[PDB]
Amino acid sequence: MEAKAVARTIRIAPRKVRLVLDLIRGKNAAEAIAILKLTNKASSPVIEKVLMSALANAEHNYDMNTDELVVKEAYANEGPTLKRFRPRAQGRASAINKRTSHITIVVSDGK
Amino acid sequence: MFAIIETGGKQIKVEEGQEIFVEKLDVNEGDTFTFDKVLFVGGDSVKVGAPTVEGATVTATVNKQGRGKKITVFTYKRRKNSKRKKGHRQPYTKLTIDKI
Amino acid sequence: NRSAVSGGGRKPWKQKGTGRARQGTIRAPQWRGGGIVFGPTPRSYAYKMPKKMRRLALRSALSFKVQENGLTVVDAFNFEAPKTKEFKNVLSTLEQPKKVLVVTENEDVNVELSARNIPGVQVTTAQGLNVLDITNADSLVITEAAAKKVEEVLG
Amino acid sequence: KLHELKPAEGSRKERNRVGRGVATGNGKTSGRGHKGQKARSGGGVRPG
Amino acid sequence: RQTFMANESNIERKWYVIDAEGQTLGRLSSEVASILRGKNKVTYTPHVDTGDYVIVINASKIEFTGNKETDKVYYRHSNHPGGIKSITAGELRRTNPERLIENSIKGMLPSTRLGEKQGKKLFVYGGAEHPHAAQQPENYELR
Amino acid sequence: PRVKGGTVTRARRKKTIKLAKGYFGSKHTLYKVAKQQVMKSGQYAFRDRRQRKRDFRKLWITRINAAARQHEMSYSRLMNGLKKAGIDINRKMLSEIAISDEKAFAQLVTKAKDAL
Amino acid sequence: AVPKRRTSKTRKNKRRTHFKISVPGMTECPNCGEYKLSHRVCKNCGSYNG
RNA sequence: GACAAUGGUAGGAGAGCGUUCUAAGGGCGUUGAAGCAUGAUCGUAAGGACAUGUGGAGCGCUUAGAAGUGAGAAUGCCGGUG
RNA sequence: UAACUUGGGAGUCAGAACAUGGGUGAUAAGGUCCGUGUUCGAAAGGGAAACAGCCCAGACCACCAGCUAAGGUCCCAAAAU
RNA sequence: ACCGAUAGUGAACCAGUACCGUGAGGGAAAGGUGAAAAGCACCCCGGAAGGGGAGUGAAAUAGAACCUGAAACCGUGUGCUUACAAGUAGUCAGAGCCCGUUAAUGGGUGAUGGCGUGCCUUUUGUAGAAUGAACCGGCGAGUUACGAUUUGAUGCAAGGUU
């Protein structure tokens, strides 16, 4: 079939996460662990979690071989933002957007 | 082997077994209509072209009678609050060509 | 309106020198939560017309029933106490359509009560004939006495 | 016949309702012309 | 309704060659821009190029009427401030005749993509020679 | 009563957003540029229906002229001879004789010369 | 200065063409078996062997 | 039939469309109402239907009546997002 | 084919260019102020390259029909090398 | 023939409250799971949050952020197309390629050719380098009362009317 995992309302701006997700999209899932494990970026650990969960949804509760698995569809959507404030000078105030993201990964076996 | 006829204020080049869309004739569905105004005939075997030709007039079926797609005529004047929208659907009849 | 909505009475910012539009109070029409510009006023709708036209209309409303077979005279009813069973039975044994106007001479107790539970039966007296309710119905039930009342009254 | 009701012919009109678009005729300036004293709300030389 | 339109599948293109000896620049350029643009075919359609492939030879033998040998300056600006350069039809009929001819004819074609692609149908050569022998160049003459 | 009408605004704004699909970028998404582009589109269409009768005319004349010059005639003298000979086909629109049946076009050219 | 005119979301995505980030440049460890980062020490199991 | 007219701002005149509620009439609706989305439908325009998904409980049609009755501009107001 | 009277409802009171008769200015001004006509205003279409006011001409709608007006006919660009 | 959550009281909800001000004083925002909490036992990934199953339920894309769920905006994939071109972004003509409808002179895309300087306001005159609007959605401007007049309609008519 096609297994998927989701991480809803992660506290990272989604267009910082799309950077990392544009690396693992379409890779043999045996690579994608190591790729996410070796890169500088910060959105990589909280995607390693989601990937390993979507791969532990393949062996368990379905029955798939987790060598035969490519990362078919990874992506990230916007969540609810936390709008804060930052005092500029002279009485001004500038809004801040602590944005979130929903990280969705779907691994398949090509069958 | 074609013929040039004139039906609705417009010449038309026609051959044997051709569909034509002409403006709204006065004939009904199915009943055959024979064009009398022929301006040219020829193509392959004869060549008669004249101020007009008496004979071999096109015998053609009257296949369908309907209304074309709706154009929406719109025109406006800028900075002057003056716009106008009409709709239009041009009636036509389609004929099949039997004989020349 | 602007006067009645609570608050207001302070200019939210200077007339000049801020980037924003010049605004008078927080309770103007366009402001969310503002006063309403025009709209519902507490008022009345009743008017009148000449008396002759009243009598003319109330006679048209009955000539229409006589044009049709809406009218059907009967005698004074008889009841000891109000009961809707016999009343519905009488109404059904007279080929009457659903809504009948039961016009009695004077106000009656043994008829109003046994009639006013039914869906479409309206009892009324010659003192209370209505252009609305003659035409609402399509079947009259008057008594042999109230009819003379109305012809003596109506012109 | 309380569901077929026709008033006399010529006895009722719509009210003119200005300020509802250019097609009605009285849309933008609502019949008042352009700038002036007779184009303001409440603005009008008193009678006589 | 019915009116013919030429396609990429429908169009055939012939080659022509024409001596410029004894010719005037403009009087040749007009009759050649017509052939390039392809409006002597019967199947002329505006949107596709039904034109032909024209070869011009003996471009060192064109003529100029009146005092154009020294007048009739060609100007061109390099887009640098003060970068305007000047030449004359005399100093170009002998120095680079196959650009004289090119400019004269290419100012006569419309300035669009189809016109840009139609201008490169023109192959201009001084002297009576040309490398386009494998094309079966047909011999045209003006009128 | 209070007429809090909000179902009709959306409906006509949809009907005008959907009349501009295929337009570059924001022109097919936002009501206030899509509406302007639909107005301009209707105006251009009104104008172009008039010009489409003027463009094909010049096209037909171009091609009839290209055909007649092969027989060594102008367009002008061809049409003069035609109008003078009585032979009065829709000679511009029927630039199809020149392509389809070329021998009949030689026919017409010879009649045109005979009228001179 | 201020932008005179907002950036169309086509020009935004054109400017963001080169904002992609590159692969880590990794290899397979000849001892760990798992992946290492070339010229670095295997985080997973042990030595560097160089 | 025949003939005439049919550019148009300020402005005058006329005929209509649609929303909300009411009266009367006559319907539809868990075998699926409004609403939303999709379409290549119908009318001269405002507009109307139909099929299809989603939705899960009210809605239309006829004739009249009554209006907080129609939004693209007010450095409008409020919210959301670029 | 209008004219007039009686009534209901108005908007308008910043006009412009060109041609012609003048004042003022310097026989300056796309100046300014009057008479006279037209066009724009409130007018789209063809021509004057583009160009409210110049020339032709007044759009009910549709047609891949014809005759023409100003203006044109070597190529751009329809039609006379 | 009143509102129905930007409406109706400022306040449908712990509202004269957060909050703002030395003070007098100003003052919001905030409703809706389901018929019934039956509010997700147990397993798996994970530090947890969050998920995927199994369940409850008529329905879980009804999971307490809980009816429907639009637009802006942000994404993922693909059918046509685009790296010699001077673009108020469209309209008319049109090859090619790709599909197949409220079945009708079909829908998508668009090589190339013609024409073409947004809208509103104010002006003699604005493509205007004059104004206004980032976008989207909701709210937002000739009304009511009592009098005068003029018109049409109706009832009577030297009477008419409360």
Which tokens in the block code for residue C1?
């309106």
Q: How many domains does chain A have?
A: 1
Domain that holds residue A46: 1-111
- The answer to whether some atom of strand H lies closer than 7 Å to the beta carbon of D39 is no
Q: Are E25 and E62 in contact (CB under 8 A)?
A: yes
β-strand partners of A73: A106
CA atoms within 13 A on the CB side of G46: 10
Q: Are C115 and C87 in contact (CB under 8 A)?
A: yes
Q: Are A110 and A68 in contact (CB under 8 A)?
A: yes
Chain C residues 38-57 with a CB less than 8 Å from chain D: none
Question: Nearest CA to A22 among G26, G22, G36, G27?
Answer: G22
Segment F78-83 long-range contacts (CB within 8 Å, at least 24 positions apart): F78/F109, F78/F112, F81/F111, F81/F112, F81/F113, F81/F114, F81/F115, F81/F116, F82/F108, F82/F111, F82/F112, F82/F115
CA gap F17, F38 in Å, rounded: 9
DSSP assignment of B22-57 equals EE--S--SEEEEE---EEEEESSS--EESS---SSP
| Residue type (1 letter), D5 | L
CA distances from D25 to B86, D10, D20, D22, G19 (A): 18, 22, 9, 6, 56
Q: Are A103 and A46 in contact (CB under 8 A)?
A: yes
CA G22, C1' J108: Å apart? 37
Contacts of residue B34, Cβ cutoff 8 Å, sequence gap at least 6: B57, B58, B59, B60
Give residues 15-34 of chain D lying near strand I (Cβ < 7 A): 31-34
CA F22, C1' J80: Å apart? 13
- The answer to whether some atom of strand I lies closer than 7 Å to the beta carbon of B32 is no
CA gap D27, E38 in Å, rounded: 56
Domain that holds residue F16: 1-116
Provide, as residue numbers in chain E, all residues whose Cβ is less than 8 Å from the Cβ of B68.
none
Closest Cα of chain B to D11: distance in Å? 32
Full strand arrangement of the beta sheet holding E138-139: E122-124, E53-57, E15-19, E138-139
What secondary structure letter does DSSP report for C15? Answer: S
Q: How many CB atoms lie within 10 A of CB B3?
A: 23
CA gap B40, B47 in Å, rounded: 8
Q: Is A87 helix (H, G, I), strand (E, B) or coil?
A: strand
Q: Are A71 and A107 in contact (CB under 8 A)?
A: yes
Left (φ > 0), alpha (ψ -120 to 50) or beta: where does D19 sit? left
CA distances from F27 to B74, F37, F42, F58, F82 (A): 19, 7, 15, 34, 51
CA gap E110, E119 in Å, rounded: 9
Q: Note whether G5 contacts F: Cβ–Cβ < 8 A.
A: no
* Contact yes or no for B21 and E2 at CB 8 A: no
Q: Are B73 and B36 in contact (CB under 8 A)?
A: no
Q: How many domains does chain F have?
A: 1
Report the length, in residues, of chain C. 155
β-strand partners of C140: C101
Q: Which residue has the tokens 């506290």?
A: A11
Task: Output phi, psi for C122, to 5 deg.
Answer: -125, 115
- Domain edges within chain E: 1-143
CA gap F29, F20 in Å, rounded: 8
Chains G and D touch (3+ CB pairs under 8 A): no
Question: Nearest CA to E101 among E123, E80, E79, E83?
Answer: E123
DSSP assignment of E114-140 equals HHHHHHTTEEE-SSS--S--TT--EE-
CA distances from A44 to A12, A50, B29, E9, E83 (A): 11, 10, 74, 55, 57
CA gap F104, F98 in Å, rounded: 8
Q: Chain J bases under 7 Å from protein CB?
A: 1-11, 16, 26-29, 43-46, 48-53, 65, 70-77, 84-86, 88-96, 104-105, 108-115, 118-123, 126-127, 134-146, 152-156, 160-162
| HEC sequence for chain F | CCCCCCHHHHHHHHHHHCCCCCCCHHHHCCHHHHHHHHHHHHHHHHHHHHHHHHHHHHHHHHHHHHHHHHHCCCHHHHHHHHHHHCCCCCCCCCCCCCCCCHHHHHHHHHHHHHHC
Q: Resolution reached, in Å?
A: 3.1
Question: Nearest CA to E18 among E49, E62, E50, E51?
Answer: E62
CA gap B72, E44 in Å, rounded: 33
CA F92, C1' H4: Å apart? 34
Q: Are D28 and D22 in contact (CB under 8 A)?
A: yes
CA gap F113, F85 in Å, rounded: 9
